[PDB]
Amino acid sequence: AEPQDGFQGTRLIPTGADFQSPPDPFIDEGEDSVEGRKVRHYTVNFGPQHPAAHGVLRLILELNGEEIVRADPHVGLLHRGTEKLCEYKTYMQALPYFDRLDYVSMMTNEQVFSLAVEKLLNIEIPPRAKFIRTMFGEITRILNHLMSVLSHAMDVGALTPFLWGFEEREKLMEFYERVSGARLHAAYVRPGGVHQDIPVGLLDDIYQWATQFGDRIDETEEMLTDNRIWINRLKGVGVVSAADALNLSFTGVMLRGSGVPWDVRKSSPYDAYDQVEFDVPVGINGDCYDRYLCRMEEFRQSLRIIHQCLNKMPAGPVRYEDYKITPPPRAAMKENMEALIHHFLLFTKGYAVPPGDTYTAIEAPKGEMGVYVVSDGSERPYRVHIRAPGFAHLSGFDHITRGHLLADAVAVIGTMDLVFGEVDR
Amino acid sequence: ATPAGPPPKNFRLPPPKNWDEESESTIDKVGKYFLMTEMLRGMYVLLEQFFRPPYTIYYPFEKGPISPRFRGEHALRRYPSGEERCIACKLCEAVCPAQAITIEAEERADGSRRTTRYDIDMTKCIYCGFCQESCPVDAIVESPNAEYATETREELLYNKEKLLANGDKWEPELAAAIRADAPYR
Amino acid sequence: QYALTTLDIITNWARQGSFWPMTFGLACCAVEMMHLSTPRYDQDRLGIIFRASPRQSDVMIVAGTLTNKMAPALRQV
Amino acid sequence: ISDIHITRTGKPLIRIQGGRSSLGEHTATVFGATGQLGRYIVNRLARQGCTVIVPYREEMAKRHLKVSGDLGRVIFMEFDLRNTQSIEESVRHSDVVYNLIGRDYPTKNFSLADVHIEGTERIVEAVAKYDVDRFIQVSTYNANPDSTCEFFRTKGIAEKVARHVFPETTIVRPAPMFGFEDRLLLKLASVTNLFTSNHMREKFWPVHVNEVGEALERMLYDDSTAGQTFELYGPRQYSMAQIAELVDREIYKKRRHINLPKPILQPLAELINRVLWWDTGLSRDQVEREFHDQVIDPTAKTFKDLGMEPTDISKWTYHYLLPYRPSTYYDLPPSTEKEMREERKYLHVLDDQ
Amino acid sequence: MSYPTRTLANLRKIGLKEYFRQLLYIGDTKYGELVGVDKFGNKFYENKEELPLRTRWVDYAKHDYDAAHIEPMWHAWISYQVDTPPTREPLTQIERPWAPKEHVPNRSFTRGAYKPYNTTQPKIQSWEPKAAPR
Amino acid sequence: VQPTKFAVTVRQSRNWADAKQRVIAAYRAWIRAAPEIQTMYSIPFPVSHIRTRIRQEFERHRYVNKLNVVDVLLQQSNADFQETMNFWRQQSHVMAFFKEEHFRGEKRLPSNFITGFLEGRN
Amino acid sequence: TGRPASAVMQAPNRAEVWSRSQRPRSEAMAGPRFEQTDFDAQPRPWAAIELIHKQPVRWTHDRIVACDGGGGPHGHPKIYINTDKPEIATCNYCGLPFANEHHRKYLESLPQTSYPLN
Numbered sequence A: 001a002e003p004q005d006g007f008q009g010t011r012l013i014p015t016g017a018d019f020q021s022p023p024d025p026f027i028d029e030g031e032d033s034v035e036g037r038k039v040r041h042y043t044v045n046f047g048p049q050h051p052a053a054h055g056v057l058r059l060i061l062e063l064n065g066e067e068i069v070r071a072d073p074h075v076g077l078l079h080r081g082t083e084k085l086c087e088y089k090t091y092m093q094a095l096p097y098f099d100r101l102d103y104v105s106m107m108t109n110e111q112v113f114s115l116a117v118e119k120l121l122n123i124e125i126p127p128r129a130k131f132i133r134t135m136f137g138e139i140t141r142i143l144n145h146l147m148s149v150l151s152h153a154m155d156v157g158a159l160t161p162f163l164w165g166f167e168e169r170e171k172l173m174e175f176y177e178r179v180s181g182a183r184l185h186a187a188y189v190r191p192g193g194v195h196q197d198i199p200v201g202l203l204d205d206i207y208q209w210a211t212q213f214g215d216r217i218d219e220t221e222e223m224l225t226d227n228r229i230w231i232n233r234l235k236g237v238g239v240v241s242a243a244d245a246l247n248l249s250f251t252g253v254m255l256r257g258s259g260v261p262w263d264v265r266k267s268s269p270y271d272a273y274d275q276v277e278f279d280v281p282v283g284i285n286g287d288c289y290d291r292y293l294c295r296m297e298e299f300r301q302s303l304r305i306i307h308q309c310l311n312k313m314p315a316g317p318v319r320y321e322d323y324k325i326t327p328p329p330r331a332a333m334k335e336n337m338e339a340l341i342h343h344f345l346l347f348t349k350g351y352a353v354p355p356g357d358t359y360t361a362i363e364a365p366k367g368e369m370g371v372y373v374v375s376d377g378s379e380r381p382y383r384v385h386i387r388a389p390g391f392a393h394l395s396g397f398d399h400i401t402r403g404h405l406l407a408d409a410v411a412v413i414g415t416m417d418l419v420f421g422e423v424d425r
Numbered sequence B: 001a002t003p004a005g006p007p008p009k010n011f012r013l014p015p016p017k018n019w020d021e022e023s024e025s026t027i028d029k030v031g032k033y034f035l036m037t038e039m040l041r042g043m044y045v046l047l048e049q050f051f052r053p054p055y056t057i058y059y060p061f062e063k064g065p066i067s068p069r070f071r072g073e074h075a076l077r078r079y080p081s082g083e084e085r086c087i088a089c090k091l092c093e094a095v096c097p098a099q100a101i102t103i104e105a106e107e108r109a110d111g112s113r114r115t116t117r118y119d120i121d122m123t124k125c126i127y128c129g130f131c132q133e134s135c136p137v138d139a140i141v142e143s144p145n146a147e148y149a150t151e152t153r154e155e156l157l158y159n160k161e162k163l164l165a166n167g168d169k170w171e172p173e174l175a176a177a178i179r180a181d182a183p184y185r
Numbered sequence C: 001q002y003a004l005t006t007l008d009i010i011t012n013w014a015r016q017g018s019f020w021p022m023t024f025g026l027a028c029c030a031v032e033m034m035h036l037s038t039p040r041y042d043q044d045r046l047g048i049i050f051r052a053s054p055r056q057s058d059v060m061i062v063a064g065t066l067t068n069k070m071a072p073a074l075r076q077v
Numbered sequence D: 001i002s003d004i005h006i007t008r009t010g011k012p013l014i015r016i017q018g019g020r021s022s023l024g025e026h027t028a029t030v031f032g033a034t035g036q037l038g039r040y041i042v043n044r045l046a047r048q049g050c051t052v053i054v055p056y057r058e059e060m061a062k063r064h065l066k067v068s069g070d071l072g073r074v075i076f077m078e079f080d081l082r083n084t085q086s087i088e089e090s091v092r093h094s095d096v097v098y099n100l101i102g103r104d105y106p107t108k109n110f111s112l113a114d115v116h117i118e119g120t121e122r123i124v125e126a127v128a129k130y131d132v133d134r135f136i137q138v139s140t141y142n143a144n145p146d147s148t149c150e151f152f153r154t155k156g157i158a159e160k161v162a163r164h165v166f167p168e169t170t171i172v173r174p175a176p177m178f179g180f181e182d183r184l185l186l187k188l189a190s191v192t193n194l195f196t197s198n199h200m201r202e203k204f205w206p207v208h209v210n211e212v213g214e215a216l217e218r219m220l221y222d223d224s225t226a227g228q229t230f231e232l233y234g235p236r237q238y239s240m241a242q243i244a245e246l247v248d249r250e251i252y253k254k255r256r257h258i259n260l261p262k263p264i265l266q267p268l269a270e271l272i273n274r275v276l277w278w279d280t281g282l283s284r285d286q287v288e289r290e291f292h293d294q295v296i297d298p299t300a301k302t303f304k305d306l307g308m309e310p311t312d313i314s315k316w317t318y319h320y321l322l323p324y325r326p327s328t329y330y331d332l333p334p335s336t337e338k339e340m341r342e343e344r345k346y347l348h349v350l351d352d353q
Numbered sequence E: 001m002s003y004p005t006r007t008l009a010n011l012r013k014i015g016l017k018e019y020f021r022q023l024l025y026i027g028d029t030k031y032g033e034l035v036g037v038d039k040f041g042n043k044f045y046e047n048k049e050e051l052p053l054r055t056r057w058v059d060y061a062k063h064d065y066d067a068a069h070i071e072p073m074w075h076a077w078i079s080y081q082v083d084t085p086p087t088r089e090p091l092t093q094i095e096r097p098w099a100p101k102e103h104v105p106n107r108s109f110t111r112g113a114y115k116p117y118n119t120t121q122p123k124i125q126s127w128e129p130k131a132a133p134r
Numbered sequence F: 001v002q003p004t005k006f007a008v009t010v011r012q013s014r015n016w017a018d019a020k021q022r023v024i025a026a027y028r029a030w031i032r033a034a035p036e037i038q039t040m041y042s043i044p045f046p047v048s049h050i051r052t053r054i055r056q057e058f059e060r061h062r063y064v065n066k067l068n069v070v071d072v073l074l075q076q077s078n079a080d081f082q083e084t085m086n087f088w089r090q091q092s093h094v095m096a097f098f099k100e101e102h103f104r105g106e107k108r109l110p111s112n113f114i115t116g117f118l119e120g121r122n
Numbered sequence G: 001t002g003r004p005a006s007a008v009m010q011a012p013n014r015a016e017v018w019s020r021s022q023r024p025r026s027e028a029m030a031g032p033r034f035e036q037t038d039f040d041a042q043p044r045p046w047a048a049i050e051l052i053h054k055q056p057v058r059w060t061h062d063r064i065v066a067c068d069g070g071g072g073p074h075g076h077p078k079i080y081i082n083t084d085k086p087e088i089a090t091c092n093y094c095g096l097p098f099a100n101e102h103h104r105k106y107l108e109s110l111p112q113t114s115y116p117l118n
């Protein structure tokens, strides 16, 4: 009989406090005396004006000398109301909003929204689209790890690998511009497949880059992996146990670094990841050094997947073949009545999506990215909620940093793959 | 943590090894420590790069590569006769994810369906190509041009005059880019 | 007159030759901005050095979406 | 006070009152808007959605004015006061023109008469050629063409020229204004030593620059302010010494004035102005100006006529000078016995670190 | 980064005057075959033995060189968007009497900067008052 | 408390007696903090003027007779109090709370019918 | 705000507006924002209405004529135009004029036509 039952406050609702069980005491392991003197902490604001590791980050820390007492990240400096805007857009019009969430991982961001909409559309995309999206997925994973690992290396003082690897970014950004017409915000992966087919000379150009990328990974490992300064900066820093990582909502490398073998591409396969072979790097100490080694090995497995996609690329259409969902080819639209109508309706009204809801998750470069979409049967989504892995990771910053040195905070900010378009949305 | 079923073979790590049991000689261990062998190896890598060709190009005398699909400055196009391609369908105004296009239209003096206002707010536009994809006559296109930074924000409020002039200037690129990519569109 | 133009040329040559931006890298535009310091374009070849604090900087590059929550910080720097 | 304003020449202005995007309907030119006071009139007009024409000399100096208005509202024009084409290109579209052009010192290029008398005369002649509705001419307190002081004198003739060419000229006589970026409160609060040949005994009624800017806006709205004259001053008379007392009382620093005598300081003030290239706050006609004492005309409209009540400068020293009071831990007054006792509840060194 | 043998060779192929002039704008010692000239007077060169993306380059006609001075179709060529230079490009030969005759550079920061305006009439027209006589 | 400086765990009130104590407790903390609020945001008003605003905010909700609604208002008050006493708010946020500092005034609605009509709906 | 011909002419090839809601350039480029400006530098594309009417009539004997703009996939959607009325038929996309040969003598009789006829 809520909420009038609350008008006069009967039957308080049970909290988690009302279910605290006393531990079993048998097996439970857990004057002007100067010991009673209190210690005053000083509270320091870090960011966003004063330089931080990266992004729009106001990090408010309570310190005891050099040690972190409380860590309090203030976010929303990049909260742009993306989730509300999506309710005033068609599904086509909302797709570019996903490029701008994790804005170094554009195609996998648009991949997760395409898969969720495809699920409510009840359509199976063509095999060539599946292989193109998987291929661009691992190209985007390398682009992300190049940004993440190297800028994390640059934050702790290692200038040079960032320069070397961003030329690799330039080469892979050319592939993004060749398929779409953009360096970053491709809007390439759409529900139904991909916008347009790849130009006839792209696969060989990707292959030529693939023959030399292993050396680029190796030269990066020459400066960091065995370097004793790098090890002393990362080993034993930002430790989280396997049990707490699950309870903190950690996904991806932040979870696999603590020993849990789990990859969304393996557990719930999507696109063509069931048709490709790859290994999952897993750490054992749950620290920044293990997470660095997992990400370096993910470079090699991504390249290994890309080579398989180059050889397994099938022929056929790249867009689902129903002009009620995907736009017809321009020659069809100018030729026959049916195609022109379907072109007109898809670009003014949009396609109608059957009502319902779904939670769809992928293994994004920064961990489990998910999207929760509610369809009301119309051409605009009723609700779009985005699950960003960086949001859960930064929410754990206090748990992993309390009691530790202020001089290790830059290491764990970089060990979390943190882009604040993901965090704030 | 592990999947249901029996533990994966050899998932449990063997017990830690004591200092005594390390399979590495003292002289090698002491030598690497005092001589900093892995740091010397990393320095040697830099000298190898010091004698490799740099990747730098000398912009604006040289330019980076762009594709026929590249999405830059907007333009309004004509037919070979010079008639406007635009017929005020409003498909680009409806699909626009950022509401950057504003259009008004009536019958022209000759009775043709044409626009009277065609504005693009370049400070609202997200450069996604949706208008160019939605246009049934190839009227709105994105040119390859990207070098049009302006002194004032008002210079980025393009009206129909600015857009038709852009199409007149850039038409040979616009036709070449359409020529190369139209088979894939 | 000619003297004052000469100092004008000299003082302007120094402002162009050492162009030090304070990159307020708010979002994805900062990624393209970050690619100007990389080997392909190498802004350092022209004298551009990115600076972390506004005190050492001559130019502010606002590269990103400015939210209301963030605007007071931008005005402060 | 309404959605309709009818201008002197009859134009009806149907106005949508609001903020940045609204329709104020007025087109205004503000000469000398790049100075201390020009920011408060330009800001007030632009944020009502009025079009403000800003003639400028230095580009980097006027950059802050654009923020006031919506797109297309603040318009900049390159101008020289001896380029007539530039003055009347800046004015031919306006229905109100503010003349805020003044200078307390002579320069190599402009005598006080060149910038004030000849300056006004070119602007006022442009106003009459295009039939601008309201020409508000800003002047000085003590403006009198019979004064020995060239400042007051050249502000006197320019009043007479403006009223002759354009009889409906509105003359505004502000007293020395304080406020943000003023030359009263911060000048006292900042310079280590002042060369004042009168022991800071000149008296006047300081008025907030904000209220002068607001007053200028209020004359635009009422057609009854045309052909009028406005002395604009604060409630209470002060002297440079008494205001310096307030300044010192707020920044915890002691003022020190050398006070060289007039026959020696005045020629030196001339030399410094002819060899240094900036406003030194010191010049021959400025030393003479400090012996004069602001005398308020009794036959001139005041803030009363505009519905305003000026605030006293002592209400504003703390606000405007707060960022100049030291806040180092070294400077707090001694700890109370309450403070001495609580310190013994804390450890004051980390021995483990 | 030229290297000694590259710079020494290009010096011999170009001479010291040209070498120093090239050092005054591009800051390198480049030599190649003249591909063509655009309407503004920019000269375009090709050399396929250069480093990738450095095989095409422009010598600007104007001392205050700006990237917007490049003729449209040449802009595609130098950015590797096409391989056929405008000298052999048939789409540059279609006669458009409306096409701008002189080159259009970026006009920002000058008095030729584009001024936007409403291109339509007011949506509402007030009555024109006509006081009927008594 | 434990999470951050002025953090109050969200709890329902048991009864109207419980709610009244919290409301008076919330008011007491607010008007006590008024001297600190002035010097912490350099507010150009006296503590008297600030403390009046506190009472009016509590008086807009004096007539609430629903327990669940009170719990909502109490949670809002704690959230506003924490973000004020922690220097999380900026001077722009606190200054916007004082309705006098808007350039169109504080009497932002017409006094009566004829003043609003003559100006054009206010 | 405009004396020169670029500031008055609606287009280089047409003085007058070609739609009723079109703002005349003389009023559009007037006001304070156009004071210190070069007017020849402003974008002034040619009027499309004047150019299409220089196109000669494409004569045909067939009653129905297809038009797609002539670029194949690079033109407009293919439509079919009826030439049975004794007048010049115009494509509703590209404005191209079409006429049947049956009406040539009456169209040649007409004092002035919308299209050159030759």
Ligand SMILES: NC(=O)C1=CN([C@@H]2O[C@H](COP(=O)(O)OP(=O)(O)OC[C@H]3O[C@@H](n4cnc5c(N)ncnc54)[C@H](OP(=O)(O)O)[C@@H]3O)[C@@H](O)[C@H]2O)C=CC1
Pocket: D031, D032, D033, D034, D035, D036, D037, D038, D056, D057, D058, D061, D080, D081, D099, D100, D101, D102, D103, D110, D115, D138, D139, D140, D141, D174, D175, D176, D177
């Ligand atoms: N401030 C005060 O206490 C008092 C001021 N007044 C009068 O109030 C008005 C505004 O005062 P305030 O804003 O404080 O003065 P400022 O000195 O701050 O600004 C004066 C303005 O005049 C312009 N100007 C000066 N000389 C010339 C010139 N030769 N040609 C063109 N422009 C010129 C300046 O432009 P630029 O920045 O380019 O130099 C500047 O914008 C002036 O008329 C002044 O005389 C009178 C009594 C008291």
Ligand code: SF4
Pocket: B085, B086, B087, B088, B089, B090, B091, B092, B093, B103, B131, B134, B135, B136, B137, B138, B139, B140
């Ligand atoms: S540009 Fe194309 S899509 Fe937009 S109104 Fe013109 S014809 Fe229609």
Ligand code: SF4
Pocket: B092, B095, B096, B097, B098, B099, B100, B101, B120, B124, B125, B126, B127, B128, B129, B130, B131, B132
């Ligand atoms: S590019 Fe995208 S955002 Fe810009 S006008 Fe075209 S549809 Fe709108």
Ligand SMILES: [Zn+2]
Pocket: G067, G068, G069, G076, G091, G092, G093, G094, G095, G096
């Ligand atoms: Zn046609």
